[model samples]
Target: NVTGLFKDCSKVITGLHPTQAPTHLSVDTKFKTEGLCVDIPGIPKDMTYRRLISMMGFKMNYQVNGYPNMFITREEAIRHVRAWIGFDVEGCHATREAVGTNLPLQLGFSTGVNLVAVPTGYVDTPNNTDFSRVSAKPPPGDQFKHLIPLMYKGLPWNVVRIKIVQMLSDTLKNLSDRVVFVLWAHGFELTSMKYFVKIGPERTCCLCDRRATCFSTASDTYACWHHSIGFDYVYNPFMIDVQQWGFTGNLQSNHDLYCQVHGNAHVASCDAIMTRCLAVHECFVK
Candidate 1:
């Protein structure tokens, strides 16, 4: 447990005991109050966002509107996107929040039009060393190949976690039925029943890469079933001991706490963060 960036040691806190009482209003112990602290214990306040943004390089420029959202240079765009997503991430209030009500709202990113949470939560891993929650999971089939069963049987927990990021990006743009091409390592499940409408010029029932055609008159942006799934999970990962890093408890995440990192490209934001978080196991795809 004495492992991590910046810090010399990260104590392995006790797992939440089923009968440990949900700690409704308790603020005395870290278990009940840990999620309440928005800022990390030792990180600097002013430059935390800036330093983080410097990490997520070029790649954030995919104007979901099919055009560039900002005219800033790569560095500038990174900063702006960092500002935008960072604002939201900080507003999320991971600290000073509890699981009952605030946590849900703190999660479920708000994109003006609506909210989304991606995969609800990955598999449940009670015994830190157990892979049972992530074992035997299927891979991300072509585009929308997994939607139907995922809607019914539920997606594997890991896929749900990483895939939800794409879902969040798409949802934030409020796109309707256009195919969104994205890349990420895969394997996970999604459980939760929230659904969102396919926004834009026209709503389409299909969500595959091939037939998810385009319409000029319609919104340049398009969407698929994942949008609806993300909307459902906004409130929470809808999971218990399960987590992105596969650790029994919490993991230190830059993007998890701030948006500056999320605004950059995958190499800078998503990939880099996940790579560092990989030690925790199955927290995010490459």
Candidate 2:
């Protein structure tokens, strides 16, 4: 394809077979939703906890009150709340990040607890043509509604192609459910499962959410469901938005921190990095 932000037309892409789900991987590929990559070549598909500790320092772990557990049994895990984590999704798109949101130029997710930030990838100014992925929603009428077109003037766009590989024995897809996915807002990750990464907080349950999720009932406020519980996706209790909650706590500006370094404010190191990413995207996007 000769279409993109920095496409050097001198060497345009000849052609590619856009792949969908199941055809992506044998071990990890089959367990995904529909989306794709250039299937020109390659294979996608790991080992156990021990055997080559001498080779790489295999430190097998056991349970000692959630702090340290040698890979506890599913029952032991069932006994506790899943890991608490919050991630941020920043993209060149002007709208939110739900399936209702657009595909990200970058995606950031990390282990939870005592840390949170929005992380993301890059973008392409002329890259908005990919209609299948760049879908987004209108901003809420409540606040910052004027920045849409002014923001959408242009630009809109990844990480290394993200994947879930059970072939590795331990994959993001495998570890997904064991932890809770706290995010600034989460619908995009869940609804747009077919996008870059298919792993969402509640995705571990089944291929199709027999019941739809929060984005639908919540209206188009584009609020972050970060504080919302991820594991109980079925019940969706505490389906509150993290950014929204932060608003209640008197976060004067969502775009303020990362460097603002004031405790009790949303401008923590992580969130700051997140907005910093947004700044980066917009500049290139322009």
Candidate 3:
């Protein structure tokens, strides 16, 4: 549903984002020179006190003569609250609906309230950011955060945003450093394999979906349920064969194990493919 909505309102910036996209002002205590405050480039300087609040989802409607009427959507308005106080509306199912309808913007504009407090940083203490980290620049310790980036090419922007929401919730350290979303015809390709882990349900491959079940067991009897979808691609019938744990299904439609499709991506459509090939070839030995 979010992706569908994105398809309706999505727009694109074809070139480089402005350098000031992530700029902000903060005191450099390290300088220790009379509360020396300088602008941090990740956010922007000259960025209005009003606009910054909007991005964090605060609806601060103000106006300057001959300048555009400043406004923010409810979604953008909430970020202000989040950045400062870390107030969570998570699990509040109605919040998204309310935002989609622009209730906060209309309501806030209708009722004015003067609330002022010390403005802390807009993000968490160790601020999260969106920057290109494709090139490696690490030497030790936990410097491996920049290993992978997410790809968003061909995906709807709303889908991309939803994906980002799911990703940020992972809570694993430096998750953003692990994925970068890009826009291309085929979209984002992640290069980092630092956290790659195998997902398995091999208590006899019982976890394979019908499209991927490779082998079947029927009581003491067995059936090689691997059907060739082409070149090492064997669709496992795990789910399909779950109810048939006592009968051998017809093998008349099965094809040869090594049958190659016109453009086979790789081998081992099932789980054992990589393990078998590596074992045979003594993989990675110089």
Instruction: Judging by TM-score against the true structure, name the best candidate.
Output: 2
**Taking the tens digit of each residue's C-alpha lDDT, what string does model 1 give over 1-286?**
3211111111223323323212333112432444552323553322111000001112223446533232233233222232222111101111111111111111122222112222221212222222212111222345324232332343343444334445444543343322211112211111111222122223342354522222211233333434333322221111111233243433334335423333433111333233333322232233
lDDT of 2 by residue, 172-244 (tens): 2233334333344444434222232221233212233232222211332111123222221222211112443
Please rank every candidate by TM-score, starting with the best.
Answer: 2, 1, 3
Evaluate model 2: give its lDDT: 0.28
List per-prediction Cα lDDT, in the order shown.
0.26, 0.28, 0.19
Model 1 lDDT, full chain set:
0.26
Give the alpha carbon lDDT tens digit for every residue of 119-196 in model 3.
111111123322211111112234222211211112332232223223222321122111111101100011110011
Q: After superposition, how far is residue 85 of candidate 2 from its true place, in Å?
A: 2.6
* Best model number under lDDT: 2
- Give the C-alpha miss distance for residue 279 in model 3, angstroms: 67
| Local distance difference test, candidate 3 | 0.19
- TM-scores, each model vs. reference: 0.19, 0.27, 0.15
Q: After superposition, how far is residue 41 of candidate 1 from its true place, in Å?
A: 42
Better lDDT candidate (1, 2): 2
